[PDB]
Amino acid sequence: PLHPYWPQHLRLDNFVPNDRPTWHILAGLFSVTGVLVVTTWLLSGRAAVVPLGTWRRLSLCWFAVCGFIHLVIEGWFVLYYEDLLGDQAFLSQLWKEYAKGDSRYILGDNFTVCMETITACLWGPLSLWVVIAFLRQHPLRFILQLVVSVGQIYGDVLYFLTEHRDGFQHGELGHPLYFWFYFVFMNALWLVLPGVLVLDAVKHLTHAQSTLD
């Protein structure tokens, strides 16, 4: 009615629609991610102590991206979820757009705020320590890769179950953009890749423990 979010009966007063077009936000976000991924490729080649494999340099790109997303994008929510509706700022309009796939991000849901606080505070800084560790070949490098990836999967599984328990009321089911892209896909990225990185860290640490015997 006055707003696009779900369920439709919510009385979300103080809401003001996005001032910018939606493509400035998604074009702008794509650039900063692009700059980061390419420069991570440059920084991996130059500043590494040993020649990293191609899939290893890509792995540092993933951790560099996650570090920025948790620290800056999700950090903004944890600070300003109280006044996110009706705010004219780049990150505020990103969340107003994203929250159409899950209205819990505008309502300041108790679980969502607490989960995001841990993600922004821990897995942001630790994602940067994984990147630094692999360049210098520090012994903690595979242990940190495990601790961050396990921490992300646990938060992501709780995210999907708690919504399923409510019955997906915070977003129209089966919608192409708001459901299958915003809710299913980009949340499932932190469910599948990280699972591949858990299997990798286990393999190298299992061999590390076997050689010590």
Ligand X SMILES: CN1C(=O)N(c2ccc(C(F)(F)F)cc2)C(=O)C12CCN(CC1CCOCC1)CC2
Is 162 a binder of ligand X (CB under 6 A)?
no
Q: How far is the CB of 88 from a copy of itself (least distance, A)?
A: 27
Per the listing, tokens 């708690």 go with: 162
Which secondary structure element, helix H or strand E, spans residue 127, and what is its range?
helix 123-136
Over the window 78 to 117, marking each residue x when it contacts a copy of itself by CB under 8 A and - when it does not, the resulting string is --------------------------------xx-xxx-x
Is 49 a binder of a copy of itself (CB under 8 A)?
no
| Number of residues located near a copy of itself, criterion CB under 8 A | 35
Is 30 a binder of ligand X (CB under 6 A)?
yes
Per the listing, tokens 């994203």 go with: 98
* Euclidean distance between CA atoms 140 and 63, whole angstroms: 15
> Binding partner of residue 195 among a copy of itself, ligand X, none, CB under 5 to 8 Å per kind?
none
DSSP letter for 82, please.
G
* Cis amide leading into 17 (omega within 30): no
Where residue 131 falls (left for φ over 0; alpha for ψ -120 to 50; beta otherwise) is: alpha
Is 156 a binder of ligand X (CB under 6 A)?
yes
Kindly give, in sequence order, each residue whose CB lies less than 8 Å from that of residue 202, ignoring residues fewer than 6 positions away. Answer: 146
Q: Is 52 helix (H, G, I), strand (E, B) or coil?
A: coil
Contacts of a copy of itself in 150-179 (CB under 8 A):
150-151, 154-155, 157-158, 161-162, 165-166
Out of 64, 73, 85, 201, the residue judged to bind ligand X by CB under 6 A: 73
From 45-53, 165-173, 183-191, 201-209, give the range in contact with ligand X by CB under 6 A: 183-191
> Binding partner of residue 38 among a copy of itself, ligand X, none, CB under 5 to 8 Å per kind?
none
CA dihedral 104, 157, 192, 169 (to 10 degrees): -40
